[PDB]
Design an enzyme around this catalytic site. Structure first.
Site, PDB file in Angstrom:
ATOM      1  N   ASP A  10       0.808  -1.212   0.000  1.00 18.81           N
ATOM      2  CA  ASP A  10       0.000   0.000   0.000  1.00 18.81           C
ATOM      3  C   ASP A  10       0.839   1.258   0.000  1.00 18.81           C
ATOM      4  O   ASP A  10       0.444   2.251  -0.628  1.00 18.81           O
ATOM      5  CB  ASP A  10      -0.943   0.033   1.199  1.00 18.81           C
ATOM      6  CG  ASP A  10      -2.154  -0.860   1.028  1.00 18.81           C
ATOM      7  OD1 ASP A  10      -2.319  -1.495  -0.037  1.00 18.81           O
ATOM      8  OD2 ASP A  10      -2.942  -0.917   1.990  1.00 18.81           O
ATOM      9  N   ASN A  44      -4.732  -2.210  -4.189  1.00 19.29           N
ATOM     10  CA  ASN A  44      -5.987  -2.312  -3.440  1.00 19.29           C
ATOM     11  C   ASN A  44      -5.833  -1.431  -2.210  1.00 19.29           C
ATOM     12  O   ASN A  44      -6.359  -1.739  -1.140  1.00 19.29           O
ATOM     13  CB  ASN A  44      -6.313  -3.770  -3.032  1.00 19.29           C
ATOM     14  CG  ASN A  44      -7.785  -3.962  -2.652  1.00 19.29           C
ATOM     15  OD1 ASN A  44      -8.639  -3.148  -2.990  1.00 19.29           O
ATOM     16  ND2 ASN A  44      -8.080  -5.051  -1.965  1.00 19.29           N
ATOM     17  N   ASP A  78     -10.364  -3.218  11.922  1.00 16.08           N
ATOM     18  CA  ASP A  78      -9.269  -4.037  11.398  1.00 16.08           C
ATOM     19  C   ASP A  78      -8.725  -4.981  12.468  1.00 16.08           C
ATOM     20  O   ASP A  78      -8.681  -6.200  12.257  1.00 16.08           O
ATOM     21  CB  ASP A  78      -8.159  -3.140  10.852  1.00 16.08           C
ATOM     22  CG  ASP A  78      -8.577  -2.349   9.609  1.00 16.08           C
ATOM     23  OD1 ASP A  78      -7.765  -1.519   9.173  1.00 16.08           O
ATOM     24  OD2 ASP A  78      -9.693  -2.539   9.071  1.00 16.08           O
ATOM     25  N   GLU A 113     -10.847  -5.171   2.021  1.00 19.05           N
ATOM     26  CA  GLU A 113     -10.016  -5.962   1.108  1.00 19.05           C
ATOM     27  C   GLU A 113     -10.779  -7.117   0.477  1.00 19.05           C
ATOM     28  O   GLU A 113     -10.514  -7.494  -0.673  1.00 19.05           O
ATOM     29  CB  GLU A 113      -8.735  -6.428   1.806  1.00 19.05           C
ATOM     30  CG  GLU A 113      -7.648  -5.328   1.886  1.00 19.05           C
ATOM     31  CD  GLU A 113      -7.831  -4.311   3.041  1.00 19.05           C
ATOM     32  OE1 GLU A 113      -8.973  -4.065   3.534  1.00 19.05           O
ATOM     33  OE2 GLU A 113      -6.799  -3.753   3.441  1.00 19.05           O
ATOM     34  N   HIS A 148      -4.433  -9.631   3.299  1.00 18.63           N
ATOM     35  CA  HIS A 148      -3.383  -9.738   4.318  1.00 18.63           C
ATOM     36  C   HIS A 148      -3.899 -10.125   5.704  1.00 18.63           C
ATOM     37  O   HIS A 148      -3.291 -10.969   6.371  1.00 18.63           O
ATOM     38  CB  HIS A 148      -2.624  -8.383   4.440  1.00 18.63           C
ATOM     39  CG  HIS A 148      -3.506  -7.189   4.696  1.00 18.63           C
ATOM     40  ND1 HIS A 148      -3.120  -6.167   5.534  1.00 18.63           N
ATOM     41  CD2 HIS A 148      -4.710  -6.823   4.188  1.00 18.63           C
ATOM     42  CE1 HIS A 148      -4.045  -5.219   5.534  1.00 18.63           C
ATOM     43  NE2 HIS A 148      -5.019  -5.589   4.724  1.00 18.63           N
ATOM     44  N   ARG A 149      -5.009  -9.536   6.141  1.00 21.00           N
ATOM     45  CA  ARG A 149      -5.485  -9.849   7.486  1.00 21.00           C
ATOM     46  C   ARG A 149      -6.076 -11.248   7.643  1.00 21.00           C
ATOM     47  O   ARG A 149      -6.064 -11.811   8.750  1.00 21.00           O
ATOM     48  CB  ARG A 149      -6.473  -8.770   7.954  1.00 21.00           C
ATOM     49  CG  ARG A 149      -5.799  -7.404   8.068  1.00 21.00           C
ATOM     50  CD  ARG A 149      -6.530  -6.428   9.032  1.00 21.00           C
ATOM     51  NE  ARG A 149      -5.913  -5.111   8.827  1.00 21.00           N
ATOM     52  CZ  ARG A 149      -4.686  -4.770   9.222  1.00 21.00           C
ATOM     53  NH1 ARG A 149      -3.952  -5.571  10.001  1.00 21.00           N
ATOM     54  NH2 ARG A 149      -4.221  -3.555   8.908  1.00 21.00           N
ATOM     55  N   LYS A 200       0.657  -6.573   1.876  1.00 21.26           N
ATOM     56  CA  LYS A 200      -0.134  -5.359   1.701  1.00 21.26           C
ATOM     57  C   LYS A 200       0.230  -4.359   2.801  1.00 21.26           C
ATOM     58  O   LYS A 200       0.327  -3.162   2.539  1.00 21.26           O
ATOM     59  CB  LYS A 200      -1.627  -5.666   1.737  1.00 21.26           C
ATOM     60  CG  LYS A 200      -2.456  -4.465   1.289  1.00 21.26           C
ATOM     61  CD  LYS A 200      -3.929  -4.841   1.085  1.00 21.26           C
ATOM     62  CE  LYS A 200      -4.760  -3.705   0.475  1.00 21.26           C
ATOM     63  NZ  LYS A 200      -5.072  -2.600   1.468  1.00 21.26           N
TER      64      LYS A 200
END
Ligand SMILES: O=C(O)C1=C[C@@H](O)[C@@H](O)[C@H](O)C1
Length: 427
Positions: free
Chosen positions: A49, A94, A313, A341, A385-386, A411
């Site tokens: 990012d 993204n 998040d 995402e 990613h998460r 990311k």
């Protein structure tokens, strides 16, 4: 399809020096680019990012240098709005923190620029921001689906009375706030109704103040902005460690510690996700606070039922930590998970069931009842990613877990697995 299999982790203990905050990094880069003077950013995050933001600044003609590890950046401020013509296309991956802020910033003056990104980015809403920018005079065209990127920006935002919906994303207001001070006319930003995930607005205002600009916040219902301002380099600026990235390590200790200390964030941090530590405490873990660290020590782990809209998040980390808690955990008021995402409510519910949990995917909440014992699963990560980082916690059990596309963690956290391994102990 690449994959990584994590073997069972018997205990976690140690110290992690956190990578820089993505939210702070991208805001600081854009403001440094708009500002007058040279800004030296330290502890900047090197991740996808941030690289998309740096690439966009390069394409727009901004000059900067990066240290070998890409965490120190010396930016030559443009001393005003950024410009480009010829429908120059900026590919933003993204990265919401590049797409939303640039969508607004590049509406200043004249321009002819196109913002686009990966397929999922073309499915993440931006209509409420475009509506607000147009009320302020901006000319914006949807090149594909109405209300979503890609966008063709032709400038024209002069300020004035702008309404913005804050019910789907806080990023639309963040983008307007950073842009408005540079518009020629004064701007009054009125929030239509509710405002989700307010702590990110506080991050935005903190950064704007660092760069020399303040506005009038009327109980988060209206923001009065004086136009004709200029951002000024703060000289050297230290980017906070990432509190969302910290969640995985603090949760790891709550589940399987040991004590895990994360450095780079502390009690004075501007990031709302430091409040994730409060949730671990409510679940039974012990938390220690420092000026530049937060640590978590294993206590016990009990299910909780809480509104998580203030930490969307980091909240995902509680969904996999719930696999280890006593009782049924319910995370509420997280509809916004669906527009990020990936649709995180759908993804999290789907993958949690694969390791044995009974899960109710609510429209805007998730209820998780852990199994007596977890089973092996190959976890799909949805280019998110998460999802990879949250499910890595499954290995703090007696079963290994296989994570598909582990590199998606880049990311926001390229070195995630190395860092998890650093605190992973066999004894
Ligand atoms: O403004 C920001 O930095 C963000 C706000 C929220 O939408 C978060 O969910 C997103 O990941 C980052």
């Amino acid at each position: 399809m690449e994959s990584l299999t994590l073997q069972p982790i018997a205990r976690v203990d140690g110290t992690i020096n956190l990578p820089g905050s993505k939210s702070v990094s991208n805001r600081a880069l854009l403001l440094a680019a708009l500002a007058h003077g040279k800004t030296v950013l330290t502890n900047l995050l090197d991740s996808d990012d941030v690289r998309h933001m740096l690439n966009a600044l390069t394409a727009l003609g901004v000059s900067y240098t990066l240290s070998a590890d890409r965490t120190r950046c010396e930016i030559i401020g443009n001393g005003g709005p950024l410009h480009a013509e010829g429908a120059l296309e900026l590919f933003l991956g993204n990265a919401g923190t590049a797409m939303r802020p640039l969508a607004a910033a590049l509406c200043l003056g004249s321009n002819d620029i196109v913002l686009t990104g990966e397929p999922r980015m073309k499915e993440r809403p931006i209509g409420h921001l475009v509506d607000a920018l147009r009320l302020g005079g901006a000319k914006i065209t949807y090149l594909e689906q109405e209300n979503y990127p890609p966008l063709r920006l032709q400038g024209g935002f002069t300020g004035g009375n702008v309404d913005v919906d804050g019910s789907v994303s806080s990023q639309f207001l963040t983008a307007l706030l950073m842009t408005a001070p540079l518009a020629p006319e004064d701007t009054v930003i009125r929030i239509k109704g509710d405002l989700v995930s307010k702590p990110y607005i506080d991050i935005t205002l903190n950064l704007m103040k660092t760069f020399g600009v303040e506005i009038e916040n009327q109980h988060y219902q209206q923001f009065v902005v004086k136009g004709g301002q200029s951002y000024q380099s703060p000289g050297t600026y230290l980017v906070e460690g990432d509190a969302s990235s910290a969640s995985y390590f603090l949760a790891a200790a709550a589940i399987k510690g040991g004590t895990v200390k994360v450095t780079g964030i502390g009690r004075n941090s501007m990031q709302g996700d430091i409040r994730f530590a409060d949730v671990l405490e409510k679940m039974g873990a012990t938390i220690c606070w420092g000026d530049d660290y937060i640590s978590c020590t294993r206590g016990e782990l009990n299910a909780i039922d809480m509104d998580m809209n203030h930490i969307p998040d980091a909240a995902m980390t509680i969904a996999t930590a719930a696999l280890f808690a006593k009782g049924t955990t319910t995370l509420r008021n997280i509809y916004n998970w669906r527009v990020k995402e990936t649709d995180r409510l759908f993804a999290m519910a789907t993958e949690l069931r694969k390791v044995g949990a009974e899960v109710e995917e609510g429209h805007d909440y998730i209820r998780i009842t852990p199994p007596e014992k977890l089973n092996f699963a190959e976890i799909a990560t949805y280019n998110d990613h998460r999802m990879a980082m949250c499910f890595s916690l499954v290995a703090l059990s007696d079963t290994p877990v296989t994570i598909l596309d582990p590199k998606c963690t880049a990311k926001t956290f390229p070195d995630y697995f190395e860092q998890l391994a650093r605190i992973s102990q066999a004894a």
